[PDB]
């Protein structure tokens, strides 16, 4: 097997296929022809190879589909517009009114909608549960019970769950594990090889890398994402990914494992500085020793990744007067851009939540999230530090 | 009030505001920052304008929305990653358990397995009604009934419905009505000024014209719009349209109105041509004579389209010897493209029925499907000559 | 020989050889691999068949100019950067030092520019001569006359060439004609089947159709094209053309026909309009019966084009009024747009600044210049009515 | 305090763009238009004039290309950008601007194959004098000075043999005797090497290689001061090339820059690991790596680049034959001209890259028969590694 970095960039495409273009054509159409209508008739039943609508399946989309599946491990992947996409598809296929779903205790804002005012709401059972906590786990696992979802680490807070350990009690009980490794990426974590059957990606983020393109991501088994592919995608969500963000998602892949080296080194500086600062009451970073679940932490992922989570002694007044303050740092939702950018979750990407809600699932009201980029980090520093003294 | 051309080049865009570009810039990227995070906060309660992230909202998908909107002649447009993301987006968000929609008799494929087997299976109630009969339509109203949902004209026997006359009903009883005017574009039929609540496209067929991108939009009011954007598209499917594929979807949409014609001319003399050869059964042309439905296709569609079908006398071998003999029409599914294409709905766009769910739902043995295109008409009528002479 | 909006539509391209594809896949790529070296030294010395650097040849790019080779009746063609690409891509390389061409009366204002403070600055020798005088042209003749240069309908007056009555005189002393035909495109003048060697053109304009890309074409016999190819894009001008916007023209080509057909009928319509007001002085459109070179326009164009020039009688200051006043219309240069255009060189463009400096070349005070684009002939009406009573 | 100069790579992500100015976008947008509008027709006067600030024409100028300009400019430490459809656009639109009819250029002894070609059988063609001179030699760079001399013009490290020429030298030599110094610095980029510090006049771009990184595009770039890029802009794009840069290749291109300073960090371990295997074998009779000691000009090297480069070139023993046979058996590294990017290329300059040369303008000037080129790309040392080590099993 070659390495990361190798299969990043060549996994599944020879040049020689494709009249020696040393970067895959983009197959920018909708749809394809057939040389008879036989063998047209044979790849809708699936008796023969080949492709017909770009909805169903496009063959720039199964390059990045291929090597994504590479990168996590897994057997077969599928992209889609957007991670809710992802998401969306998957857990339309895969449960039925009277299923019931075990939810990590924090979740993706549009997530939590999702279940509770969406799929919820059409007769899916739902009950939220602490994924570190493993007696409690095997506690709330009824014979209803077709499906564990969860992120680790959650957005925002950054809890974790023992993956391995929850994958022991899925098979004692038979259930499906799916995880959003979005955070992580396969570069840093791989659930599948952790005994998750499905991970899905929000590709929007770090696996784009540049903030130009939404798209989503789903691996796992070949049987399992068929499913996703020909009901969750096709009939369901609709949520195809164009050929063109595709192609710029497989170029942002490329660097994947420089992009998170880079972010992970910075992310690690600041969170060591913002932990000697006066200003800030507590920060979360998986690679600061004080991190409660600092052991897991090391045991699941190589690295302890680009985004921090902290509050601020003077609460959500300070919060907002800090954010203000950054002059390099962007105030915007998403992660994963060279550009560093903070946001504040209450107001915006946990909104979706009720006060209550937030107070119950672990989202505070004076926290704020940084999601740290690809620039110097003398210049990171220099404009956190001058937005702490701000923020008094 | 401008024409109809002249909006489909212009509307919604002042190149005075874009730095005099005459071409709209294309807002490829997934985020937006905020001045303030009250700014951003604000954003996300609704209250100012603006733009946080692309899969609620996007400059570019924004003016497409609107041009849309313009041509439809609805309050608010909505654009998706594809038609089943449109229909999907819209229906996911209408529709609860205990709620019944009423359907056409004939529908496309993946919207027919959408709605059977996807939220059909989720408490959703399902009945089929001919569209054309107000009479069965007003004794099928129960007062569950929540939405009335078809295609004018049906996909693939151009089975037409009476907008005007569905719309009197469900404006009694509280239904909301959605037509997917996919076959006839804005520019031949307006299903909202004939009383529908809202339309949705596949924007992959005659809006985009060049078979390149895959794409779907929703026009109606801006209330249930709103919700359809913020709940549907936000949570339940994220069917995110690219921002390239955006720019290139109004680049079409700039010439439809003489796309529209060209197909239109050739398809009627194609029509007229297939009626008097010996091989050809029946056919179904809105601009024939012979037509059953002759007289309301006259007062809702401007023009009679771009689609044919046909069966011939021979049957499915017959419909096997033609199409494996055309040389210049393409062996492909989907419609509305430069190119002309050839299609058996049985076997390839309508295998999400079974055997003989083709049949009592109007999906004939040797039906052919042709989306007559934009090439020579001469070359058209010789090659479709030769091949009536090959399927003897 | 199938007709020209199926070759614009279909030539040189079969979706069998590329996996099926409706729409050909673009080769956004620079560099090409070679399965061993003894393939890759042939490729380089022309003896194998193959692809190696995009600067040189690519596959998307080769559909391209094949496709306009045949619509010009050529054998074959070269995609450049620009119109200016293509110009001076084939200047280059057919003049030297001490050679002379022969030039139209008028030219577009950056290809005077090269020819007089450009390559006539390093030793080549430049005259103007008027193309529709064949005793003037054959007196001009000298055994330098190496390449003979026009447009015709020459910008920005729409004086026109004898095409075939130049080509002739050429044939008698050796010379190389090359005609720019970018205001009539290959849908309505072919120069080629008249006589001439080389066609160029400015894509950027009506080929393109749609504003949105910057190319230029060059189509005429092999053994030029590939010495255009090898020697002014490779090493004098570097003008490479992207795949992408080549995609993009390609997309603008299938729609040429009736781009032409409604960009000719809209200006017919203003031409008429604007001959009988009394604020216009002089017009020239070559579809009026008043237009000097009537009869020739009428053997060489098929139609007489989208663009017109007139004169207001107020001079420069009317010019302006009017010019200001335009709501629908834009301010902008170039032409060939889905959207309507206007320029008043007088208000600076073509380079000059005074009456006097102006009218060696037939540029003059109170001259305006329409695009008409594909808008609704009634909006356009009242928008030039309008502006020509602001004019007073 | 304030004053203080933004690290490079940060200048590579933010330079010349604030989101707020563009409705909040995060990324620019692409301005994929080729011609602007005017709201009166005398603010349309004063932008073909130079007046007024703002946009007519692609061509001329796009914002989507000025701010790859302004950022390249940043980057490379100049006062102005222009950005064109190729390296070959770059270079001929600022040849053709500066010289005329009895102007000298004095030229690097080894150039990439169509500048050669655009040199002695375009420009030479139509009346501008041309000599080659060693131009790490600062003695014979200074003898063959004449007042006809108006550019100078070489690459650092020079397409294939990596000879080097010290910039700060050749430009004392220029600021004496009073001629425009141009350096193609596409080998090293702006990250490795700055040329307009060490007193260049212009550097140029084949911004198709490291700075894009991905190999999707072509591209050029020519970064100066004000008066000499204006003019270039002006002249050499607008009415001598042509050579237009599609702004959507231009929004690839910033999104490679992005990312410049970690690949080429990367490429630069990859090769030096590289090296000095190769270094160690019994087949290579010699090998050019700029981060061996080995290396001809290793002080120079040291003393202008910050790091030695992606680029190897090495000959075996057994000289074109074995050559053949060692790329031939290579599977992860590709068989392929070009350069800069994630996949690591192989190639061989006497029939490829430098096959516009004569076969003794070849032994002159520097190119070997038996030289085979490497662009060592972003893969995993160890997977590249072992791909070189069967090459040379199979090659013996
Ligand atoms: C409320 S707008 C902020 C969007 C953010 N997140 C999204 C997201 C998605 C969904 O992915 P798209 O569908 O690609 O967004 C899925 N899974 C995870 C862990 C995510 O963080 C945000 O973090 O700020
Ligand atoms: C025979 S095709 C090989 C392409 C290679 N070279 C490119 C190049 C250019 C020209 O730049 P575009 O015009 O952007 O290619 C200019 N200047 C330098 C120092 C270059 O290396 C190659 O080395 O293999
Ligand atoms: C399985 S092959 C599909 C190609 C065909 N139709 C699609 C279609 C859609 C769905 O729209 P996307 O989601 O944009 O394809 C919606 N509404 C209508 C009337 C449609 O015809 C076809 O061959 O008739
Ligand atoms: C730099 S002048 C641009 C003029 C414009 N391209 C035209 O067609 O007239």
Same mark, same amino acid.
């Given at each position: 097997?070659?390495?990361?970095?190798?299969?990043?960039?060549?996994?599944?495409?020879?040049?020689?296929?494709?009249?020696?273009?040393?970067?895959?054509?983009?197959?920018?159409?909708?749809?394809?022809?057939?040389?008879?209508?036989?063998?047209?008739?044979?790849?809708?039943?699936?008796?023969?190879?080949?492709?017909?609508?770009?909805?169903?399946?496009?063959?720039?989309?199964?390059?990045?589909?291929?090597?994504?599946? !590479?990168?996590?491990?897994?057997?077969?992947?599928?992209?889609?517009? !957007?991670?809710?996409?992802?998401?969306?598809?998957?857990?339309?296929?895969?449960?039925?009114?009277?299923?019931?779903?075990?939810?990590?205790?924090?979740?993706?804002?549009?997530?939590?909608?999702?279940?509770?005012?969406?799929?919820?709401?059409?007769?899916?059972?739902?009950?939220?549960?602490?994924?570190?906590?493993?007696?409690?786990?095997?506690?709330?696992?009824?014979?209803?019970?077709?499906?564990?979802?969860?992120?680790?680490?959650?957005?925002?807070?950054?809890?974790?769950?023992?993956?391995?350990?929850?994958?022991?009690?899925?098979?004692?009980?038979?259930?499906?594990?799916?995880?959003?490794?979005?955070?992580?990426?396969?570069?840093?974590?791989?659930?599948?090889?952790?005994?998750?059957?499905?991970?899905?990606?929000?590709?929007?983020?770090?696996?784009?890398?540049?903030?130009?393109?939404?798209?989503?991501?789903?691996?796992?088994?070949?049987?399992?994402?068929?499913?996703?592919?020909?009901?969750?995608?096709?009939?369901?969500?609709?949520?195809?990914?164009?050929?063109?963000?595709?192609?710029?998602?497989?170029?942002?892949?490329?660097?994947?494992?420089?992009?998170?080296?880079?972010?992970?080194?910075?992310?690690?500086?600041?969170?060591?500085?913002?932990?000697?600062?006066?200003?800030?009451?507590?920060?979360?970073?998986?690679?600061?020793?004080?991190?409660?679940?600092?052991?897991?932490?090391?045991?699941?992922?190589?690295?302890?990744?680009?985004?921090?989570?902290?509050?601020?002694?003077?609460?959500?007044?300070?919060?907002?007067?800090?954010?203000?303050?950054?002059?390099?740092?962007?105030?915007?939702?998403?992660?994963?851009?060279?550009?560093?950018?903070?946001?504040?979750?209450?107001?915006?990407?946990?909104?979706?939540?009720?006060?209550?809600?937030?107070?119950?699932?672990?989202?505070?009201?004076?926290?704020?999230?940084?999601?740290?980029?690809?620039?110097?980090?003398?210049?990171?520093?220099?404009?956190?530090?001058?937005?702490?003294?701000?923020?008094?």
């Amino acid at each position: 097997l070659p390495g990361f970095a190798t299969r990043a960039i060549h996994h599944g495409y020879d040049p020689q296929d494709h009249g020696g273009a040393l970067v895959p054509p983009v197959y920018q159409t909708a749809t394809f022809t057939f040389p008879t209508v036989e063998y047209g008739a044979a790849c809708f039943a699936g008796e023969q190879a080949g492709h017909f609508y770009s909805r169903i399946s496009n063959p720039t989309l199964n390059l990045l589909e291929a090597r994504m599946a !590479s990168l996590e491990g897994g057997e077969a992947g599928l992209a889609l517009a !957007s991670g809710m996409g992802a998401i969306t598809s998957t857990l339309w296929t895969l449960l039925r009114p009277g299923d019931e779903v075990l939810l990590g205790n924090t979740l993706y804002g549009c997530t939590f909608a999702f279940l509770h005012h969406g799929i919820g709401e059409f007769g899916v059972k739902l009950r939220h549960v602490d994924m570190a906590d493993l007696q409690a786990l095997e506690a709330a696992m009824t014979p209803a019970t077709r499906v564990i979802y969860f992120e680790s680490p959650a957005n925002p807070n950054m809890h974790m769950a023992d993956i391995a350990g929850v994958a022991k009690i899925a098979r004692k009980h038979g259930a499906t594990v799916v995880v959003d490794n979005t955070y992580c990426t396969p570069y840093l974590q791989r659930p599948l090889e952790l005994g998750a059957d499905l991970v899905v990606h929000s590709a929007t983020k770090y696996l784009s890398g540049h903030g130009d393109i939404t798209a989503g991501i789903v691996v796992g088994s070949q049987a399992l994402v068929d499913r996703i592919r020909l009901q969750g995608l096709k009939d369901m969500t609709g949520a195809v990914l164009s050929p063109h963000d595709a192609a710029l998602l497989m170029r942002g892949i490329k660097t994947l494992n420089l992009r998170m080296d880079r972010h992970c080194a910075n992310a690690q500086v600041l969170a060591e500085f913002l932990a000697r600062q006066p200003q800030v009451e507590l920060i979360h970073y998986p690679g600061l020793a004080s991190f409660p679940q600092y052991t897991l932490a090391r045991q699941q992922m190589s690295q302890p990744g680009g985004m921090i989570a902290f509050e601020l002694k003077g609460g959500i007044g300070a919060g907002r007067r800090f954010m203000n303050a950054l002059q390099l740092f962007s105030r915007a939702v998403s992660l994963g851009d060279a550009e560093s950018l903070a946001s504040h979750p209450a107001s915006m990407t946990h909104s979706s939540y009720t006060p209550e809600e937030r107070a119950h699932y672990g989202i505070s009201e004076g926290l704020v999230r940084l999601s740290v980029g690809l620039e110097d980090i003398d210049d990171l520093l220099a404009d956190v530090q001058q937005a702490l003294k701000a923020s008094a």
